Chain A
Amino acid sequence: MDDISVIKNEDYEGSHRFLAEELLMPNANKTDGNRSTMFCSHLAQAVTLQKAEPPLVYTNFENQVGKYSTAGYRKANSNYKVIEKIYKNDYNYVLIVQDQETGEYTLFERAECEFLTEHYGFQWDNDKIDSLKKDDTIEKDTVLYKNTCYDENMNFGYGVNLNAAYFSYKNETLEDAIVISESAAKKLGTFSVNKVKVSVNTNDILLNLYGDNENYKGFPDIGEHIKNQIIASRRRFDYNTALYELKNLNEMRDSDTPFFADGKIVDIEIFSNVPEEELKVQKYNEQVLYYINKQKEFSNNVYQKLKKIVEGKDNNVSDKLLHFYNNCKMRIDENISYTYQNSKFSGFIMEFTILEEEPLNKGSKITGRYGNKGVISKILPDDQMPTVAEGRFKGLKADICLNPLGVFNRLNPSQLIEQELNWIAKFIRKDMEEAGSNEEKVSILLDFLNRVNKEETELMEEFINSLNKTELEEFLNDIIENGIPICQKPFFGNIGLDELWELYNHYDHIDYFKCEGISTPLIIGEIYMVRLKHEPHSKFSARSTSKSKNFKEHKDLYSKTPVRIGNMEISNLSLTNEMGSIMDMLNSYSNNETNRRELIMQLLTGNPFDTNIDLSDVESGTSKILKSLFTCLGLSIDDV
């Protein structure tokens, strides 16, 4: 509506009720709406980080976001007791438990990775569930497995804190470009999990890519990483009766279908529609047989253990346990014909689950909570980055360097406030470390926090007075070395121009850092940084003459989708006023098959370092078909 007089600030004062995703953004009143909406987009585009940290400057709603976003953690919902543990793989296993109140029998599943979509996934901290053994009670709110986002006390982190300085690094930090320390890039690490299906029919066999002559292994094992980005390759045969192609195991050909991924496979699920005796005779199936047997061994194992509970009259089983039991029973049961896409399939279909630690690489996009964007232009050694010299903070190196030009134009001032607060906090930490008793340290801490956030100061006084002297010393050391928590609420409770002004006036010793080779003094302060989903790999295309969807089906390493030339492109090329060469490129590259063959042949038969191509003048195949059909139509072109 036009009327905004209805909005009265006194009504919404002290409440963040009007904020949603921006509850994760400090000093949101100071950031523009455009930057805020970009931040909201980035949070969904954010990728999981192995070494995620709770933000140094926090809004205090982050833990709630971790709590109510259930995809990252598994919490027991009742008191349980561990009946038994069954293993399918070293990495994948199931735990059967009984409700201590209902008596219902339920199960919990353990796996290394969680697959979300495409390549996106994350590894699990499975410490607690792995600790559990038979006849061990699971308390009501225990967390069996957690994501890397959550910590020991279930604090939530979507990014890492990196020391940042606004500096013009050899023009590498141009526009939204960033230079990162190699150690810092190690901190910003993601996982990639892929579920890849290879379908081998009766006439297809898998080449011995991972095996010797004595032992035939055509695909990686559960504990082995993929080599050369090839899981397996299938050769289709016209008739598998001869079995003469035993000698062909090592070689590869273009006709063979190759399946591409990199990482450690962690689970194999095989769906077989072939009788066991038919499979056993051939040695080339040996590896497959093992996993098939293993699956059956797992399934049978659950069936024997749970048959009394499920098929007993009481049937105090959860629906999950019932369906798991039924599926395993179907697997062991004969006359089980597996159908994929509503059709019965020959041979077997294998699903590999592959987990890879994907590191930060050039072209990756990283951001802060304030809508800024950055692309990693260069990763440089720690020594090459700005390092302050001849101070109490001597040898401190900046993890990331950001563009100073245009910072105010972005209309997201809050990133600077985060930097200033962590930088001033460094001085407070050194002041605590340098001198005093524990009481002096808490006094300095409480004064600084009183300057920043009164609520944090009050709660910290309570928390500190609660602590024992040993615990107090440990907490103080944690603050000195790891960092200091500072609370900057989104709208109500953040500091401003006047408060930072007072902070700078009181702390006269705090002044810019003098770096080693830099004339201009610099400020180095920690900023919270997040890793975005975009990487160059998504849009890479490269094509050489002989969508296909093979790449989506993992049959091609990279997309070979052709680029399109149109009338606009032809006009811009026609600027040269040499139309014949443009037509030659079009015919040699696309339209004319004869000229295309000539180009390929000449490129491979001519001198490597001197290439001159002569193309024959011939009507294209499309033109020939057009003339033939038109003459049948009864109309003929007169070169009008």
Chain B
Amino acid sequence: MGKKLSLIDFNEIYNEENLITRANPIENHEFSDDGIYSERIFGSYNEDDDDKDIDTIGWINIEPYYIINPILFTIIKKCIPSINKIINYQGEDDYIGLVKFKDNFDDLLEKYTDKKKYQKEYDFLIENHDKIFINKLPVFSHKLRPATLLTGSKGKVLAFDEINNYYNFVIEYINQINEGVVSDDSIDLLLLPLLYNMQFYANNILTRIISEYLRGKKGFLRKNIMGSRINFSARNVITPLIGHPIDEVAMPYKTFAELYKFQLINLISKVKGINYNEALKFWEKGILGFNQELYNYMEELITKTKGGCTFLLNRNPTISIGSILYLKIGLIKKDYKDLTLGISNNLLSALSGDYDGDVLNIIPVFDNKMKEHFSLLSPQNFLVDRNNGRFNGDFDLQKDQILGIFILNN
């Protein structure tokens, strides 16, 4: 909640064009162009025609009246504990009201504060005095806050989150206040409570957005920091491979098909002169069982692609150099049942994994530029131990390999 960050002066950024001064949720059986769910300023389902993003932000005007800034409310509350009582209208001045509070705020801040307890807050109030009172409160895009239509016994009804209720309530309260000319002549003293409710609703709007961050905005973003879910990824068991170079590997039929699907569909469309959807039908048929034709397209990709077909192999935990390795797909297996990645025994020591049923993550790299940059993680570059500069025994001959050379030479 409480964060130290730059504040924004709403009045400068406020745009009169996207101003919601109409509180009506619907107008004459239609979504109001001036309503909260406005296609003109916020956008609609046809968002490509609109060219208006989620960033589109609506505005509401409280002029000629000012409210306490919702973000700055808590610090004022700590400085002035009686803020909740004082704002309501029912020392020298007590419980004067919101409009009266504005006129005497500077004196009141000195009047009811403990300097030692809240000096930093008081200094902040002096620093950002101009931003204490707000004339316009922003409303975020209706695309973020959906209103799903439902059928009702009396009539079709729109279900929507409470945030929309908070916004429309605020606009409803303000709309009547500005209209009255001869009503207001002496009513102005009981008009103040109406403004008070608006301030509380805006505070809940601020609190709800804080909860919105918890509900898959900040939680999802920090979950992404916890674990970014990458497409074009795979998990596979490792099996020993013999007779092929160390960097090259053998990949199962199913593994290659999914990761290089779009590359595979490109070739089938070009070779057979078919639509992309029709090419997908060929790929779907191949997924079910081994067919030589799709294997031929897969074999051509590994054979003829520039830089080869390469990927990154990581064994978690990724705590050591060589945990993630840049490798090449030498062969594609012709057994549908075989679902094990074939790796050289020399790679195993660097990865620190075992052929005990452990699974390694496969992340293919496509761009030739990206392929080159990740080639610094290749096994060939890791033949040199980085601390010593000597050859790394991790990539040296292992148990079975050493014995054969020993019998040969010794």
Which chain B residues have a beta carbon within 8 Å of chain A's beta carbons?
3, 5-8, 10, 13, 53-57, 69-72, 134, 137-141, 144, 205-206, 209-210, 212-213, 217-218, 220-221, 224-237, 239-240, 242, 254-255, 257-259, 261-263, 265-267, 269-270, 276, 280-281, 284-285, 287-289, 300-301, 304-306, 312, 314, 316-319, 321, 323-324, 335, 337-340, 345, 354-357, 359, 361-363, 365-370, 373-374, 376-377, 398-401, 403-404
Contact = CB atoms under 8 A, between A and B. Distances in A.
A177 B220 CA distance: 43
Interface in A555-611: 557-558, 560-569, 571-573, 575-578, 581, 584-586, 589-591, 596, 599-600, 603-606, 608-611
A506 interface: no
B240 A563 contact: no
A541 B233 contact: yes
A229 B288 contact: yes
A102 interface: no
A626 interface: yes
Contacts of B242: 170-172
A576 B339 contact: no
A307 B316 CA distance: 65
Contact of A563 (B8, B357, B363): B363
Given A539-B235, A604-B262, A609-B305, A572 B217 contact: no
Nearest to B72: A634
Contacts of B10: 634
B206 A634 contact: yes
B57 A632 contact: yes
A98 B262 CA distance: 65
Contacts of A575: 321, 376-377
Given A168-B403, A612-B367, A624-B55, A572 B324 contact: yes
Nearest to B288: A228
A9 interface: no
A568 B340 CA distance: 25
A257 to B, nearest CB: 14
Given A361-B337, A628-B141, A622 B217 contact: yes
Given A377-B240, A628-B141, A635 B3 contact: yes
Nearest 4 pairs of A and B residues by beta carbon: A564-B227, A563-B233, A542-B258, A541-B235
B141 to A, nearest CB: 6
- Among A174, A578, A610, find the residue whose CB has the most chain B CB atoms closer than 10 A: A174
Given A229-B289, A612-B367, A562 B233 contact: yes
B361 A611 contact: no
Contact of B217 (A536, A560, A561, A625): A625
A604 B323 CA distance: 31
B228 A544 contact: no
Contacts of A631: 8, 13, 57, 138
A363 B338 contact: yes
Contact of B339 (A174, A536, A573, A600): A536
B307 to A, nearest CB: 9
Contacts, number: 301
Q: Which of B53, B259, B361, B367 has the most CB of A within 10 A?
A: B367
Interface residues of A, number: 92
A604 B54 contact: no
Nearest to B280: A254
A544 B262 contact: yes
Given A171-B242, A608-B270, A612-B369, A566 B232 contact: no
Interface string A382-400: 0000000000000000000
B228 A611 contact: no
A405 B54 contact: no
A230 interface: yes
A405 B338 contact: no
Contacts of B134: 634
B383 to A, nearest CB: 15
Contacts of B366: 599, 603, 611, 613
**Residue of A536, A541, A577, A581 contacting most chain B CB atoms (<10 Å):** A536
Contacts of A518: none
A509 interface: no
A403 B55 CA distance: 64
B144 A375 contact: no
Nearest to A601: B262
A609 B306 contact: yes
Contacts of B232: 543-545, 589
B229 A590 contact: yes
Contact of A540 (B231, B266, B339): B339
Contacts of B363: 563, 565, 585, 589
A562 B377 CA distance: 22
Given A542-B259, A568-B317, A622-B220, A589 B231 contact: yes
Most B CB contacts (10 A, CB to CB) among A558, A576, A584, A626 go to A576
A581 B231 contact: no
A582 to B, nearest CB: 8
A373 interface: yes
A375 B354 CA distance: 12
Contacts of B237: 363, 536, 539-540
A403 B3 CA distance: 63
A638 B6 contact: yes
A420 interface: no
27 contacts: A171-B401, A174-B399, A228-B288, A362-B335, A363-B339, A363-B340, A365-B357, A405-B403, A536-B339, A540-B235, A572-B324, A573-B374, A573-B377, A581-B373, A590-B230, A608-B266, A609-B306, A612-B368, A622-B221, A624-B53, A625-B217, A626-B217, A631-B13, A633-B206, A634-B72, A634-B134, A636-B8
